[PDB]
Amino acid sequence: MAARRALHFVFKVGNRFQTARFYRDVLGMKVLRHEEFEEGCKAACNGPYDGKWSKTMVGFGPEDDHFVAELTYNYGVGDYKLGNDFMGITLASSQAVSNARKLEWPLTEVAEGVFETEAPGGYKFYLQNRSLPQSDPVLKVTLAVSDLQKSLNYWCNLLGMKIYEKDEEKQRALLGYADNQCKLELQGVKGGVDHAAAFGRIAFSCPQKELPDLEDLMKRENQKILTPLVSLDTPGKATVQVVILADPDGHEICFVGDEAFRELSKMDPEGSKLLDDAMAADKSDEWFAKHNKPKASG
Ligand SMILES: [Cl-]
Ligand SMILES: [Cl-]
Ligand SMILES: [Cl-]
Ligand SMILES: [Cl-]
Ligand SMILES: [Cl-]
Ligand SMILES: [Cl-]
Ligand SMILES: [Cl-]
Ligand SMILES: [Mg+2]
Ligand SMILES: [Zn+2]
Ligand SMILES: [Zn+2]
Ligand SMILES: [Zn+2]
């Protein structure tokens, strides 16, 4: 097998209704889990939405054997300016292509049988017009880098990702922890990496014993640690441990202990209905409207 496993990409969601509809009705993905969070407030809670946020996992199957989207919704935040850091997710589905066509959701053929589309927020998805394969339709996430060799030294020498493809001349590498996982594509881009406000995070699992040594290695090597090892709670569900890191271009990386994460990430059959009930009950847009002020921007 592999110790380390590609889990998900965090997407900052302005409009949850429109995001849920794109992921269900265009990509043909499903709700795996839905969790409503309340952080409370440092000072007096300003409005009924302060510290209130949701996490919805969407993808083609259980998180154990699929790479999925972590839809992060803050009830008080309505827009995120998208930079050039996240270049898209590529997946194989003629079903998604048909869905887009039937729903008149714009599609652009960028190579033979490959259709570029945009989720709400401008996040790019690349749809291969071929049959749903006999496993996870998600093939890769592509991230922009300023200095390819600097990025390979980080992602390969420090984090232990294998090189499936490397092209110095095209300034591109395809990395992965295993054949049966989502791959990470690094693409040298023009004009620097800009994270703006929509910047997400790529999550991997390792055995929990590796978390403190992963933190130490990054300290020793002078790499950025965004969040030292910490326990994160989810209402009515397992506590996991995370270290949050920053690659050489500042892409956020989450490492989480696999053994407890597998208890947290059980596919919840009620997830879809919990999302629909929370959306039916979300009057945040009407609240901000009556207060004559917008949701914050990322
Ligand atoms: Cl669903
Ligand atoms: Cl009020
Ligand atoms: Cl599968
Ligand atoms: Cl699947
Ligand atoms: Cl994460
Ligand atoms: Cl997570
Ligand atoms: Cl009100
Ligand atoms: Mg008014
Ligand atoms: Zn599957
Ligand atoms: Zn996550
Ligand atoms: Zn009011």
Side-chain angles (χ1 to χ4, degrees), residues 38-288:
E38 259 200 69
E39 297 298 306
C41 298
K42 178 178 160 57
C45 262
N46 161 0
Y49 302 107
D50 192 43
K52 302 221 175 16
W53 69 281
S54 72
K55 194 200 283 184
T56 315
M57 315 301 294
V58 188
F60 291 105
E63 288 165 77
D64 281 357
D65 284 291
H66 299 88
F67 187 99
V68 310
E70 190 157 75
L71 305 185
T72 305
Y73 175 71
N74 180 315
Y75 282 76
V77 177
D79 173 67
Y80 302 90
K81 184 170 191 186
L82 179 67
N84 66 350
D85 54 344
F86 171 85
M87 305 188 84
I89 284 159
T90 304
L91 67 93
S93 179
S94 51
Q95 189 58 74
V97 168
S98 301
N99 291 346
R101 288 183 174 150
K102 81 188 172 116
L103 290 175
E104 295 176 59
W105 192 273
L107 278 207
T108 311
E109 190 166 2
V110 296
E112 263 281 340
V114 185
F115 296 86
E116 179 196 290
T117 204
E118 285 154 89
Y123 298 113
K124 279 176 178 185
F125 287 77
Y126 290 94
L127 313 176
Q128 297 190 348
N129 196 17
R130 57 181 178 89
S131 289
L132 280 174
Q134 299 205 54
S135 57
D136 183 10
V138 175
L139 304 172
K140 61 178 183 188
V141 185
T142 306
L143 291 182
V145 304
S146 68
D147 189 306
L148 180 58
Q149 247 291 320
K150 194 175 185 179
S151 285
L152 290 175
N153 293 355
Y154 182 88
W155 284 99
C156 297
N157 301 339
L158 302 185
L159 289 186
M161 294 194 93
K162 314 143 48 156
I163 300 171
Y164 287 77
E165 298 175 4
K166 175 169 175 230
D167 199 321
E168 279 98 326
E169 297 155 342
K170 300 207 194 186
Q171 286 290 289
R172 182 192 79 82
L174 195 62
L175 310 188
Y177 279 126
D179 304 356
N180 64 354
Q181 290 182 27
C182 181
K183 309 289 178 292
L184 171 60
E185 180 172 59
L186 302 181
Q187 180 58 62
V189 292
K190 322 297 192 155
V193 185
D194 179 26
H195 292 292
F199 60 87
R201 187 190 298 141
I202 190 162
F204 299 91
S205 70
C206 51
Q208 57 192 359
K209 87 190 193 164
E210 289 190 3
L211 284 182
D213 318 321
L214 173 61
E215 192 177 333
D216 286 346
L217 164 70
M218 290 298 172
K219 185 55 170 72
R220 283 197 297 273
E221 285 290 340
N222 295 313
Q223 300 297 327
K224 194 79 173 70
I225 300 150
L226 293 182
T227 307
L229 176 75
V230 60
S231 287
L232 290 193
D233 301 321
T234 297
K237 294 195 202 185
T239 298
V240 291
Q241 287 183 313
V242 304
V243 179
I244 313 317
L245 307 169
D247 96 327
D249 286 301
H251 291 297
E252 293 200 347
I253 310 167
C254 179
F255 273 92
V256 69
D258 191 62
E259 307 93 339
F261 185 76
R262 284 175 179 268
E263 298 307 299
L264 170 62
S265 61
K266 315 155 193 193
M267 194 179 155
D268 177 357
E270 290 200 78
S272 187
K273 186 221 79 145
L274 289 169
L275 175 60
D276 288 354
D277 288 350
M279 288 192 309
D282 178 2
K283 295 303 168 192
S284 53
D285 291 321
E286 294 72 2
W287 192 87
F288 284 88

